[PDB]
Design an enzyme around this catalytic site. Structure first.
Site, PDB file in Angstrom:
ATOM      1  N   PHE A 278      54.699  38.275  37.803  1.00  0.00           N
ATOM      2  CA  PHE A 278      53.819  38.738  38.402  1.00  0.00           C
ATOM      3  C   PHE A 278      54.144  38.025  39.739  1.00  0.00           C
ATOM      4  CE2 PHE A 278      49.061  39.006  39.140  1.00  0.00           C
ATOM      5  CZ  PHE A 278      49.100  39.633  38.686  1.00  0.00           C
TER       6      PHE A 278
ATOM      7  N   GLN B 198      43.775  39.868  52.706  1.00  0.00           N
ATOM      8  CA  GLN B 198      44.225  40.990  51.524  1.00  0.00           C
ATOM      9  C   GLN B 198      45.052  41.578  51.341  1.00  0.00           C
ATOM     10  OE1 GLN B 198      46.557  39.168  47.253  1.00  0.00           O
ATOM     11  NE2 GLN B 198      47.363  38.411  49.031  1.00  0.00           N
TER      12      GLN B 198
ATOM     13  N   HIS C  65      45.436  44.446  48.396  1.00  0.00           N
ATOM     14  CA  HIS C  65      46.556  44.466  47.522  1.00  0.00           C
ATOM     15  C   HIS C  65      47.517  45.663  47.364  1.00  0.00           C
ATOM     16  CE1 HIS C  65      47.571  44.836  43.507  1.00  0.00           C
ATOM     17  NE2 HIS C  65      47.014  43.386  42.377  1.00  0.00           N
TER      18      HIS C  65
ATOM     19  N   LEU D 273      41.225  49.207  41.647  1.00  0.00           N
ATOM     20  CA  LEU D 273      42.592  48.209  41.476  1.00  0.00           C
ATOM     21  C   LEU D 273      43.317  48.560  40.114  1.00  0.00           C
ATOM     22  CD1 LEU D 273      44.557  45.364  42.361  1.00  0.00           C
ATOM     23  CD2 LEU D 273      42.513  44.713  40.855  1.00  0.00           C
TER      24      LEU D 273
ATOM     25  N   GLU E  75      48.732  43.482  38.873  1.00  0.00           N
ATOM     26  CA  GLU E  75      49.817  43.837  39.627  1.00  0.00           C
ATOM     27  C   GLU E  75      50.870  42.957  38.404  1.00  0.00           C
ATOM     28  OE1 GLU E  75      50.512  41.845  43.651  1.00  0.00           O
ATOM     29  OE2 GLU E  75      51.637  39.718  42.229  1.00  0.00           O
TER      30      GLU E  75
ATOM     31  N   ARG F  14      52.692  39.585  48.291  1.00  0.00           N
ATOM     32  CA  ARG F  14      51.441  40.599  48.361  1.00  0.00           C
ATOM     33  C   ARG F  14      51.438  41.980  49.803  1.00  0.00           C
ATOM     34  NH1 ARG F  14      46.636  39.295  44.356  1.00  0.00           N
ATOM     35  NH2 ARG F  14      47.859  39.764  42.273  1.00  0.00           N
TER      36      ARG F  14
ATOM     37  N   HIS G  71      41.527  43.522  49.334  1.00  0.00           N
ATOM     38  CA  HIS G  71      40.599  42.975  47.893  1.00  0.00           C
ATOM     39  C   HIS G  71      40.626  41.722  48.085  1.00  0.00           C
ATOM     40  CE1 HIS G  71      42.056  42.292  44.085  1.00  0.00           C
ATOM     41  NE2 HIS G  71      42.667  41.177  44.638  1.00  0.00           N
TER      42      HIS G  71
ATOM     43  N   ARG H  11      47.360  35.067  49.660  1.00  0.00           N
ATOM     44  CA  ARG H  11      47.277  34.374  48.163  1.00  0.00           C
ATOM     45  C   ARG H  11      48.341  34.970  47.275  1.00  0.00           C
ATOM     46  NH1 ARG H  11      44.867  35.579  43.735  1.00  0.00           N
ATOM     47  NH2 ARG H  11      43.484  37.428  44.410  1.00  0.00           N
TER      48      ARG H  11
HETATM   49  C1  LIG Z   1      38.343  42.845  42.795  1.00  0.00           C
HETATM   50  C2  LIG Z   1      38.780  41.618  42.323  1.00  0.00           C
HETATM   51  C3  LIG Z   1      40.047  40.405  42.388  1.00  0.00           C
HETATM   52  C4  LIG Z   1      40.526  39.759  41.460  1.00  0.00           C
HETATM   53  C5  LIG Z   1      40.956  40.594  40.382  1.00  0.00           C
HETATM   54  C6  LIG Z   1      40.628  41.673  40.168  1.00  0.00           C
HETATM   55  C7  LIG Z   1      39.760  42.512  41.368  1.00  0.00           C
HETATM   56  C8  LIG Z   1      39.115  44.167  41.109  1.00  0.00           C
HETATM   57  N1  LIG Z   1      41.786  39.884  39.436  1.00  0.00           N
HETATM   58  C9  LIG Z   1      42.179  39.289  39.647  1.00  0.00           C
HETATM   59  C10 LIG Z   1      43.385  37.943  38.573  1.00  0.00           C
HETATM   60  O1  LIG Z   1      44.012  38.900  37.800  1.00  0.00           O
HETATM   61  N2  LIG Z   1      42.801  37.039  39.028  1.00  0.00           N
HETATM   62  C11 LIG Z   1      43.042  36.191  39.703  1.00  0.00           C
HETATM   63  O2  LIG Z   1      43.958  35.357  40.427  1.00  0.00           O
HETATM   64  N3  LIG Z   1      42.816  37.002  41.037  1.00  0.00           N
HETATM   65  C12 LIG Z   1      42.182  37.939  40.671  1.00  0.00           C
HETATM   66  N4  LIG Z   1      41.029  39.089  41.961  1.00  0.00           N
HETATM   67  C13 LIG Z   1      40.712  37.857  42.785  1.00  0.00           C
HETATM   68  C14 LIG Z   1      39.287  37.534  42.139  1.00  0.00           C
HETATM   69  O3  LIG Z   1      38.428  38.145  41.041  1.00  0.00           O
HETATM   70  C15 LIG Z   1      38.620  36.599  42.977  1.00  0.00           C
HETATM   71  O4  LIG Z   1      39.005  36.214  44.218  1.00  0.00           O
HETATM   72  C16 LIG Z   1      37.013  35.174  42.512  1.00  0.00           C
HETATM   73  O5  LIG Z   1      36.917  36.301  40.784  1.00  0.00           O
HETATM   74  C17 LIG Z   1      35.791  35.181  43.259  1.00  0.00           C
HETATM   75  O6  LIG Z   1      35.415  34.259  42.034  1.00  0.00           O
HETATM   76  P1  LIG Z   1      33.987  34.194  42.597  1.00  0.00           P
HETATM   77  O7  LIG Z   1      33.433  32.596  41.815  1.00  0.00           O
HETATM   78  O8  LIG Z   1      34.729  33.350  44.040  1.00  0.00           O
HETATM   79  O9  LIG Z   1      33.482  34.810  43.093  1.00  0.00           O
HETATM   80  P2  LIG Z   1      32.290  36.080  42.587  1.00  0.00           P
HETATM   81  O10 LIG Z   1      33.073  36.196  40.728  1.00  0.00           O
HETATM   82  O11 LIG Z   1      32.181  37.707  43.829  1.00  0.00           O
HETATM   83  O12 LIG Z   1      30.884  35.086  41.832  1.00  0.00           O
HETATM   84  C18 LIG Z   1      29.770  35.891  42.757  1.00  0.00           C
HETATM   85  C19 LIG Z   1      28.749  34.992  42.770  1.00  0.00           C
HETATM   86  O13 LIG Z   1      27.316  35.292  43.844  1.00  0.00           O
HETATM   87  C20 LIG Z   1      27.102  35.767  43.327  1.00  0.00           C
HETATM   88  N5  LIG Z   1      25.419  35.904  45.172  1.00  0.00           N
HETATM   89  C21 LIG Z   1      26.757  35.893  46.060  1.00  0.00           C
HETATM   90  N6  LIG Z   1      25.279  36.694  46.984  1.00  0.00           N
HETATM   91  C22 LIG Z   1      25.207  35.354  46.479  1.00  0.00           C
HETATM   92  C23 LIG Z   1      23.624  35.792  47.312  1.00  0.00           C
HETATM   93  N7  LIG Z   1      23.497  36.399  48.668  1.00  0.00           N
HETATM   94  N8  LIG Z   1      22.400  35.028  46.721  1.00  0.00           N
HETATM   95  C24 LIG Z   1      22.895  34.436  45.520  1.00  0.00           C
HETATM   96  N9  LIG Z   1      23.560  34.898  44.978  1.00  0.00           N
HETATM   97  C25 LIG Z   1      24.865  35.339  45.313  1.00  0.00           C
HETATM   98  C26 LIG Z   1      26.748  36.228  43.009  1.00  0.00           C
HETATM   99  O14 LIG Z   1      25.969  37.508  41.824  1.00  0.00           O
HETATM  100  C27 LIG Z   1      27.592  35.936  41.733  1.00  0.00           C
HETATM  101  O15 LIG Z   1      26.888  35.564  40.780  1.00  0.00           O
HETATM  102  O1  LIG Z   2      46.511  42.528  39.964  1.00  0.00           O
HETATM  103  C1  LIG Z   2      46.271  41.604  39.942  1.00  0.00           C
HETATM  104  O2  LIG Z   2      45.581  41.855  38.465  1.00  0.00           O
HETATM  105  C2  LIG Z   2      44.894  40.969  40.760  1.00  0.00           C
HETATM  106  O3  LIG Z   2      44.633  41.241  42.091  1.00  0.00           O
HETATM  107  C3  LIG Z   2      45.481  38.929  40.759  1.00  0.00           C
HETATM  108  C4  LIG Z   2      44.680  38.804  41.388  1.00  0.00           C
HETATM  109  O4  LIG Z   2      45.620  37.856  41.735  1.00  0.00           O
HETATM  110  O5  LIG Z   2      43.871  38.861  42.544  1.00  0.00           O
END
Ligand SMILES: *Cc1cc2c(cc1C)nc1c(=O)[nH]c(=O)nc-1n2C[C@H](O)[C@H](O)[C@H](O)COP(=O)(O)OP(=O)(O)OC[C@H]1O[C@@H](n2cnc3c(N)ncnc32)[C@H](O)[C@@H]1O
Ligand SMILES: O=C([O-])[C@H](O)C=C([O-])O
Ligand code: HEM
Ligand SMILES: Oc1c(Cl)c(Cl)c(Cl)c(Cl)c1Cl
Ligand code: SF4
Ligand code: F3S
Ligand code: FES
Ligand code: NA
Lengths: 122, 588, 238, 105
Positions: B119, B240, B242, B252, B255, B286, B354, B399
């Site tokens: 990666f 960041q 992507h 997306l 990667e 990145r 991203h 990141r």
């Molecule tokens: C966008 C993305 C990110 C991503 C990825 C692919 C995509 C399309 N692939 C990744 C990967 O392979 N490896 C990795 O390390 N990271 C990857 N990313 C980044 C990663 O997915 C995100 O950084 C990470 O998932 C963040 O997780 P987190 O637990 O911090 O955030 P969330 O999953 O989006 O949860 C948000 C929750 O909060 C609740 N929420 C939001 N606002 C409110 C309010 N106002 N009131 C009550 N609840 C709220 C949401 O409902 C949700 O449950």
């Molecule tokens: O490219 C991915 O699968 C994703 O973007 C990974 C991180 O860490 O965010």
């Protein structure tokens, strides 16, 4: 208290779904048909007279129609039922394609029996 | 109190990766816990994660947590806090095996161990040969992780308030955070969740942009709530982008495509990444790969078609078998949103907003930080953060791939692991008065009364376009000063925006308006910050200050909400188990 | 080119019963879009229209809808696949579930059946692994086509047997999850699980209608899964 | 339990499928259906037994089947139990009435 979308008329149904809704109907119909078939069979055995009285009934066109339906319903339930069992035993794949394909062949095998039924009753 | 009060030891606002791990942990630790989420838990953005989790398991080849710590510290461009990064990489393996034991369906090596793939930014021997340490389930890892964590919460009988929208934090007359108000989306009821510990875990805010890989629900709600509560946010300018989002779509592609052997081509068919990053090539940092693709475009070496300007991502040479086995997810994505079958033709990509490096500053424990008038750190009593909403900071100015999921799990766990001591350490918090609670409702009450105001649709579009043209991959001093001014304007328009739907039974309109307030606060704190940092480090890239300035900017930037001004915090450079990695020149 | 919609509407505080409302959207002729695109735009014009959506990339499972009579996800159903000259694009809530508001249904029973099959790894702790549970690629493949489910509710809400006993029959979605733990090599409670599925309703309410298969946006096959469960059940109690 | 029903239904199906083949066999190859060749067929021990065997098969198969139908559509407990009572007495009549018809031939 809340509404629900169960308006059957607003929903697409695949051929596989048709296939079994008919299997269900054909089954219920056959349940009634067995009493009717028994009532007839009983007549046609009690005496030489009763038998004539029966094949007399079987002469009526209205009877011949019902009799063909009854046999067609039974024909269907059997063919489609064997289709069902064939999946349950692994002779048929449970994929969607294989479902459609077999549901059609079921319909055809049934139409062929339905004719051979009319020929038996005409 | 004229409002129902629901009391818990902890209230966890958010049910994605970090929030669900933290909930799970806090609960098994004896305490009561409410898990809030504005969508059904398994719809959180975490579900859309693909690549996998970066962690020194050492399954694919013999590895070492310090190698991973090096990759991260370098990748962060030396403003990642080293003590926390040490905590993460070192803890990692155990925290991740724990997930496998929860049933997470990882892909497998021939001997039966968790599959790991190469990666971006992964070396052996402190900057040596390329490594492969991202553990994955196909390219659906986020989905596997989230669903596992939900089931674990199901098994564990966690209290989950699904589809409740957190409005704003509640402060006692001492400035301590004693819970928050939330709106039940289904019924419209508004309640006060009363907690000795409010853990913010609300994820990212990629929706402040015009094009993003983020879900519609990523509206920086946590950043807004914190700002309005008087709580500073940090490094908000590090966004960041992507390298490989689908051109003209934003969706997306992992990667993992490049980690499995894919490379980037320009309009002439040159593998241009060997030029920009001789050693790491298409697996460089990145921020770097992002700029490279953007430069190639900015000099007419980009490709064109129905997708818009883009670079070509070539995969076909890996073979149908490998693609369908290791990357089936992007197969459907590329076919669906690009009308391109990666088995035959290259995928049209372009850097896309991203992940949010910034957020609420926290200690490893999860405790939220603020500064006093002397500039020293102080803990915000009752407030915690984990996941993307938090800036620990383990990612600094850039990141690493797979490092977010690791983060979620490690720090979500840690936060629960240390919740008892945190609560004891802060002491009993005085109760919130009725007017304290009433204050939280102000933001909501405005919308409920504004009938003839401005159209929020137009305001959001204005906002996103602004960030897109002024705070994208490359920034200049002039644009940023003008963007910032247009924001002040846009933000005025919003104080007078209207709620066109007045109803109370599952009224999504009110939610999206409440969300817009947070899009705003976030977008603003980002702009004010990007101006402030007069250098170029990681993702932040200014033409008028192209050099990395380790003499004046070896630190975090901190946005003070009350005075709307900027300041600084030290970057930690004192690990415990090995000597710090000194800042040096960063090239791939 | 202009697009015409007929959308299900309902708000308890205003509507006596549900109703179909007409909508029109001016669409860029050259470009094609997704139904969810249209929905989002319709909401700008009429802010009262409530529906669910998040990831917009067919992964989260939020926006399940009955579109032109058939279930699927708005975020990945192209307008061009629903549009036919002279007929409106008809959009209604998933069948059989309570309607909360407009296109939003109450997924309660759906999740309920999910929990019923105990959808979490149950390993009795004996012979612990030195590190991760060792699972050979051959065994890991058995999870393929099973773990990808997004709990979108498409299959179950298109199953008659689920319509009639949403609380006794597990439904496609659930039974898929049940099998997903039934063949996980790391799950050591296989027999205990099977004993809980031996009554006349849990699994056996299924006739092979195959609606489940034709709608799954992830192309999964609940029919085959329920098939395997029945074998195991016979294998055990026959 | 359900596994029992599942098997019983399919077992009786195989029996009844054999009966139908045998009965269609007779019909398809007999021609002139005189009262004498008809009664002769039904005097045969094979025909008597196969038929009664077939009637039991319906009793079981049809009962299981009709039960499934009722428990989908007929919700109210009272009305349903009443309908099952009919359906069952009906089925039992079938078998008894057959015992009366064929035993006396
Ligand atoms: C966008 C993305 C990110 C991503 C990825 C692919 C995509 C399309 N692939 C990744 C990967 O392979 N490896 C990795 O390390 N990271 C990857 N990313 C980044 C990663 O997915 C995100 O950084 C990470 O998932 C963040 O997780 P987190 O637990 O911090 O955030 P969330 O999953 O989006 O949860 C948000 C929750 O909060 C609740 N929420 C939001 N606002 C409110 C309010 N106002 N009131 C009550 N609840 C709220 C949401 O409902 C949700 O449950
Ligand atoms: O490219 C991915 O699968 C994703 O973007 C990974 C991180 O860490 O965010
Ligand atoms: C002769 C009188 C018969 C009657 C009254 C009858 C009736 C029924 C009924 C009421 C059902 C339940 C319908 C449903 O679940 O929707 C059913 C199902 C079935 N029928 Fe029959 N049937 C008869 C003969 C046969 C025969 C000869 C076969 C051989 C194929 C057969 C095969 C089946 C099978 C395999 C099912 C399985 C339905 C299920 O449980 O999934 N039936 N039948
Ligand atoms: O009750 C049923 C209904 Cl409504 C339909 Cl549409 C179908 Cl296809 C079947 Cl098989 C049954 Cl049992
Ligand atoms: S099995 Fe398919 S249709 Fe059913 S809930 Fe899962 S993704 Fe949806
Ligand atoms: S649509 Fe329903 S009855 Fe069975 S094969 Fe299907 S779950
Ligand atoms: S919105 Fe995520 S599945 Fe359609
Ligand atoms: Na962050």
């Amino acid at each position: 208290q809340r509404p629900v979308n169960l308006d059957l008329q607003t929903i697409r149904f695949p051929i596989t779904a048709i296939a079994s809704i008919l299997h269900r109907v054909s089954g219920v119909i056959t349940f009634v048909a067995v009493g009717i078939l028994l009532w007839l069979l009983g007549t046609s055995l009690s005496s030489p007279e009763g038998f004539e009285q029966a094949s007399a009934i079987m002469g009526s066109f209205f009877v011949k129609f019902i009799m063909w339906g009854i046999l067609t319903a039974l024909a269907y339930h059997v063919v489609v039922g064997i289709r069902h069992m064939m999946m349950d035993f692994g002779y048929l794949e449970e994929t969607f394609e294989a479902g459609k394909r077999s549901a059609k062949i079921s319909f055809v095998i049934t139409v062929v029996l339905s004719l051979l039924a009319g020929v038996l009753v005409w | 109190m004229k409002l129902p009060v629901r009391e818990f030891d902890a209230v966890v606002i958010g049910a994605g990766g970090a929030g669900m791990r933290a909930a799970l942990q806090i609960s098994q630790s004896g305490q009561t816990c409410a898990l809030l989420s504005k969508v059904f838990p398994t719809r959180s953005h975490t579900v859309s994660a693909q690549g996998g989790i970066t962690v020194a398991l050492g399954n694919t080849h013999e590895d070492n947590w310090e190698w991973h710590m090096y990759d991260t510290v370098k990748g962060s461009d030396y403003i990642g806090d080293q003590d926390a990064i040490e905590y993460m990489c070192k803890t990692g393996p155990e925290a991740i095996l724990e997930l496998e034991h929860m049933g997470l369906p990882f892909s497998r090596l021939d001997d039966g161990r968790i599959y790991q793939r190469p990666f971006g930014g992964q070396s052996k021997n402190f900057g040596g040969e390329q490594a492969a340490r991202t553990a994955a389930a196909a390219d659906r890892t986020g989905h596997a992780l989230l669903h596992t964590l939900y089931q674990q919460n199901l098994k564990n009988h966690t209290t989950i308030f699904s589809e409740w929208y957190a409005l704003d934090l509640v402060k006692n007359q001492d400035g301590a955070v004693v819970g928050c108000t939330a709106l039940c989306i289904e019924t419209g009821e508004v309640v006060y969740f009363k907690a000795r510990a409010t853990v913010l875990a609300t994820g990212g805010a990629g929706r402040i942009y015009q094009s993003t890989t983020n879900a519609h629900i990523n509206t920086g709600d946590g950043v807004g709530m914190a700002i309005r509560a008087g709580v500073p946010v940090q490094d908000m300018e590090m966004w960041q982008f992507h390298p490989t989002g689908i051109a003209g779509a934003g969706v997306l592609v992992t990667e993992g495509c490049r980690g499995e052997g894919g490379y980037l081509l320009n309009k002439h068919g040159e593998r241009f990444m060997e030029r920009y990053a001789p050693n790491a090539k298409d697996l460089a940092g990145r921020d770097v790969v992002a700029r490279s693709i953007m430069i190639e475009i900015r000099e007419g070496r980009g490709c064109d078609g129905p997708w818009g300007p883009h670079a070509k991502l070539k995969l076909d040479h890996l073979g149908k078998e490998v693609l369908e086995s290791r990357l089936p997810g992007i197969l459907e994505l590329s076919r669906t949103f690009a009308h391109v079958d990666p088995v035959k033709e290259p995928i049209p990509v372009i850097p896309t907003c991203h992940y949010m490096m910034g957020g609420i500053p926290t200690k490893v424990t999860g405790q939220a930080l603020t500064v006093n008038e002397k500039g020293e750190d102080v803990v915000v009593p009752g407030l915690f953060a984990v996941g993307e909403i938090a800036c620990v900071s383990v990612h600094g100015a850039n990141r690493l791939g797979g490092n977010s999921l690791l983060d979620l799990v490690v720090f979500g766990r840690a936060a629960g692991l240390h919740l008892q001591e945190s609560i004891a350490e802060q002491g009993a918090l005085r109760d919130a008065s009725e007017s304290d609670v009433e204050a939280s409702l102000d933001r909501l009450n405005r919308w409920n009364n504004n009938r003839n105001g401005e159209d929020p649709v137009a305001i959001r579009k204005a906002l996103q376009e602004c960030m897109q043209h002024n705070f994208s991959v490359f920034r200049e001093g002039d644009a940023m000063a003008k963007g910032l001014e247009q924001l002040k304007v846009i933000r005025e328009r919003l104080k007078n925006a209207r709620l066109d739907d007045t109803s109370s039974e599952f009224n999504t309109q009110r939610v999206e308006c409440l969300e817009l307030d947070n899009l705003m606060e976030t977008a603003y704190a980002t702009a004010v910050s990007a101006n402030f940092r007069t250098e170029s480090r990681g993702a932040h890239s200014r033409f008028d200050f192209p050099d990395r300035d380790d003499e004046n900017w070896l630190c975090h930037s901190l946005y003070l909400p009350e005075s709307e001004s900027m300041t600084r915090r030290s970057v930690n450079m004192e690990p415990k188990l090995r000597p710090a990695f000194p800042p040096k020149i960063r090239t791939y | 080119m202009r697009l015409e919609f007929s959308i299900y509407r309902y708000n308890p505080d205003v509507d006596d019963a549900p109703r179909m409302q007409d909508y029109t959207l001016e669409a860029d002729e050259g470009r094609d879009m997704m139904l969810l695109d249209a929905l989002i735009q319709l909401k700008e014009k009429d802010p009262s229209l409530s529906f669910r959506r998040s990831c917009r990339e067919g992964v989260c499972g939020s926006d399940g809808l009955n579109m032109n009579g058939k279930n699927g996800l708005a975020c990945i159903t192209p307008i061009s696949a629903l549009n036919q000259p002279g007929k409106k694009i008809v959009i209604r809530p998933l069948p059989g579930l309570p309607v909360i508001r407009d296109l939003v249904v109450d997924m309660g029973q759906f999740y309920a059946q999910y929990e019923k099959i105990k959808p979490y790894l149950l390993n009795n702790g004996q012979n612990p692994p030195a590190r991760e549970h060792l699972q050979m690629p051959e065994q890991r493949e058995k999870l393929d086509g099973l773990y990808e489910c997004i709990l979108c509710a498409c299959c179950s809400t298109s199953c008659p047997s689920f319509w009639w006993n949403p609380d006794k029959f597990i439904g496609p979605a659930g039974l898929l999850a049940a099998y997903r733990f039934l063949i996980d090599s790391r799950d050591t409670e296989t027999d205990s699980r099977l004993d809980g599925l031996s009554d006349a309703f849990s699994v056996f309410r299924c006739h092979s209608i195959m609606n489940c298969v034709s709608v799954c946006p992830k192309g999964l096959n609940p029919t085959r899964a329920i098939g395997h469960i029945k074998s195991m059940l016979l294998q055990r109690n026959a | 339990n359900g596994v029992h029903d599942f098997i019983l239904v399919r077992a009786t199906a195989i029996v009844l499928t054999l009966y139908i083949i045998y009965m269609v066999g007779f019909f398809a190859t007999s021609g002139e259906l005189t009262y004498e060749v008809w009664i002769g067929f039904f005097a045969s021990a094979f025909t008597k037994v196969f038929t009664l065997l077939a009637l039991f098969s319906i009793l079981i198969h049809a009962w299981i089947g009709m039960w499934q139908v009722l428990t989908d559509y007929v919700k109210p407990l009272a009305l349903r139990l009443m309908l099952q009572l009919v359906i069952v007495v009906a089925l039992v009549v079938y078998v008894i009435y057959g015992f009366v018809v064929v035993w006396g031939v």
